[PDB]
């Protein structure tokens, strides 16, 4: 029962009761705190009251299930695209879609049937060019990239990689799950913050992180991007989500277009914590605060385990990362900031990290 | 835009507004009417208020989402088993599980569910409802490899019953594993409403029971239940549940409440059958060709022999204020066109009378009777 976190009573997006202790939550991905947004709950409750617990399929001549139409329109507005397809689960979008779009080549980061897999060195623009240039020119290619790397919390040099992909006419898919609602002028993701609107073919994402519900999505401006809905070799098995789930998702997505205060709060919190932990002499994954993830690097599994324990006991919950996920000898304590964390909470978090870090011998 | 049914305003499980008309609903699979059950709604609302619109994964050693633990316990109690695995979607359970459990043979009915009718599994199709073709085809297979026979309790097309008792015994003649879909039976077949398998006294002889929350339960998702000791390993199956999501607080809450209520909903169960039998007998006494001579399930299918005629009667019925299902080949044998009624435990005896009146009126006008 490793690092099993069971949250018995949940006060808010930033605090719950874990093992009988009032604990600050700092290891979940509820970036914009939408899971408890008053309007979101209300929408969910209304949908429950008006439409009940579930509905039936109502397919309408194409893989548009009638209950997704509204949420799919919210995504169109949010991303400013013409195409939007909602999936029942995050993964049916996460990697489900890749096997759908690809004998053909799939080129993806090393630390990211019917498709030849090609792995390029992590964050290496040049290895991407080298590996791409060694491939047969005729066949169809898809390059998969992430806006934010969830491990250390750094930024992919998309602008450079995207251009290197188009050097080869390859199609580009970008995952913007860890950026939704707080990167670029409209909060569309890292791709937007780097001025790539219109140069990216497909943007995948999930409702788990910022939106705050089950499911995922793809968005595109590809004229033919409706055919996707009907892919039955790479399945269009998918369920229609219940009234409350779609209601919540829609409301949440629409609110994410205007949540300027949450967006400013998220970054303050992120920068406050990043700078703070750094000034205590912690080895962080990034020199500059690049995203909402702040990862503290430790060099000893035991030491990492103990600090986590100390932090939890002290009233703070953060993520534990280790190999296999990380490079061997790399152990991470991973903080994920919430737009709903108060400046006071961030100060308490800093106090706690100091206290714990000292006690264990990290600082 | 074929027979597209969009329900703008939904009064209850049995009536809504379709194309500006107050319409009786008789083509959905909300058998026990749980989608609007007061306790179910309440449970959903509270879970939303207490736990929010969603929670993170909280997956563990055995891929078990903490958020499913409670709903998975309800299934254990309901089916009286030790094993219960909830899935994010109906299909991840419906056929997802089959490809999971099977260079191996999968033996299934030729008309296997519109979900069932890829990879690592050699497909073997036996003649519909033919106990003997099942024996014949099974006996022609290599003895050594692992085999799974998939069967349904209720055939959704005509609304008849699989002779499970016989087929199950024929499978065990060959040591093959048995999977039974009990989606169209949940809550109203057998002493505990566990399905056709139970009504035929097969408790303990069936390896896996699959099902969905769509029909009786009244929400997204599906499940498998088992008594197999090793039936926890499945959770960690290379592809088919390490792509599963944890359902949000309101979905789980609703499902649990609904499932627990389905253990005691005796009145609903007695109402469902009355409605089913009233309709079946009634339509029959008007001279309609039904899929079954006796009322065997909650599905009552009217058989027509002409696509155009079938299409027009559906149109007439809809205009008259009734919504039923249209079935056509590819889903049916060619030249078989069905109007499929699906009874609800929440249909009043008055509504069933109105339905009969409507079917009479329409059928006459079109030329079916």
Curated annotation (Swiss-Prot), chain B:
GO terms for molecular function: acyltransferase activity; pyridoxal phosphate binding. Changing residue 56 to W: 147-fold decrease in catalytic efficiency for L-serine. Affects the chemistry of the pyridoxal phosphate. GO terms for biological process: biosynthetic process; sphingolipid metabolic process. One of its GO terms (cellular component) is membrane. The modification N6-(pyridoxal phosphate)lysine is found at residue 215. Not inhibited by relatively high concentrations of palmitoyl-CoA. Inhibited by both D-cycloserine (DCS) and L-cycloserine (LCS), which inactivate SPT by transamination to form a free pyridoxamine 5'-phosphate (PMP) and beta-aminooxyacetaldehyde that remain bound at the active site. Inhibition is reversed by incubation with excess pyridoxal phosphate. Inhibited by the fungal natural product myriocin, which acts as a competitive inhibitor for both L-serine and palmitoyl-CoA substrates. Its cofactor is pyridoxal 5'-phosphate. Its EC number is 2.3.1.50. Pfam families: Aminotran_1_2 (PF00155). It is an enzyme of class 2 (transferase). Changing residue 328 to N: 60-fold decrease in catalytic efficiency for L-serine. Pyridoxal 5'-phosphate binds at residues 90-91, 184, 212, 214. Changing residue 56 to Y: 410-fold decrease in catalytic efficiency for L-serine. Affects the chemistry of the pyridoxal phosphate. Is less able to stabilize a quinonoid intermediate. It catalyses: L-serine + hexadecanoyl-CoA + H(+) = 3-oxosphinganine + CO2 + CoA. The keyword Nucleotide-binding does not apply. Catalyzes the condensation of L-serine with palmitoyl-CoA (hexadecanoyl-CoA) to produce 3-oxosphinganine. Exhibits a broad substrate specificity concerning the chain length and the degree of unsaturation of acyl-CoA. This is Serine palmitoyltransferase. It comes from Sphingomonas paucimobilis. The lineage of its organism: Bacteria, Pseudomonadati, Pseudomonadota, Alphaproteobacteria, Sphingomonadales.
């Amino acid at each position: 029962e490793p690092f099993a976190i069971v949250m018995e009573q949940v006060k808010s997006p930033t605090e719950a009761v874990i093992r009988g202790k009032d604990t600050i939550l700092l290891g979940t991905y509820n970036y914009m705190g939408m899971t408890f947004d008053p309007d979101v709950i209300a929408a969910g409750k209304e949908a429950l009251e008006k439409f009940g617990s579930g509905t039936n399929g109502s397919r309408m001549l194409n893989g548009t299930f009638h209950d997704h139409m509204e949420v799919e329109q919210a995504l169109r507005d949010f991303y400013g695209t013409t195409g939007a397809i909602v999936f029942s689960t995050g993964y049916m979008a996460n990697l489900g879609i890749i096997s759908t779009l690809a004998g053909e080549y799939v080129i993806l980061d090393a630390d990211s049937g019917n498709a030849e897999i090609v792995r390029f060195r992590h964050n290496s623009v040049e290895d991407l060019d080298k590996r791409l240039g060694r491939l047969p020119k005729e066949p169809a290619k898809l390059v998969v990239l992430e806006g934010v790397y969830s491990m250390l919390g750094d930024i992919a040099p998309l602008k450079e990689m995207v251009a290197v992909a188009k050097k080869h006419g390859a199609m580009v898919l970008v995952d913007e799950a860890h950026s939704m609602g707080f990167f670029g002028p409209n909060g569309r993701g890292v791709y937007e913050a780097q001025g790539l609107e219109g140069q990216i073919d497909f943007v995948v994402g999930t409702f788990s992180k910022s939106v705050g519900t089950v499911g995922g999505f793809v968005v595109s401006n590809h004229p033919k991007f409706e055919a996707v809905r009907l892919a039955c070799r790479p399945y269009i098995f998918t369920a229609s989500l219940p009234p409350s789930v779609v209601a919540t998702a829609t409301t949440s997505i629409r609110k994410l277009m205007t949540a300027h205060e949450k967006r400013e709060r998220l970054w303050s919190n992120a920068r406050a914590l990043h700078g703070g932990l750094k000034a205590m002499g912690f080895r962080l994954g990034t020199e500059t605060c690049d995203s909402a993830i702040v990862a503290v690097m430790l060099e000893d599994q035991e030491q990492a385990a103990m600090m986590w324990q100390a932090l939890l006991d002290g009233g703070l919950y953060v993520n534990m990362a280790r190999p296999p996920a990380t490079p061997a000898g790399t152990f991470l304590l991973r903080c994920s900031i919430c737009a709903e964390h108060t400046p006071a909470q961030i100060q308490t978090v800093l106090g706690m990290f100091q206290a714990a870090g000292r006690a264990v011998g990290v600082i």
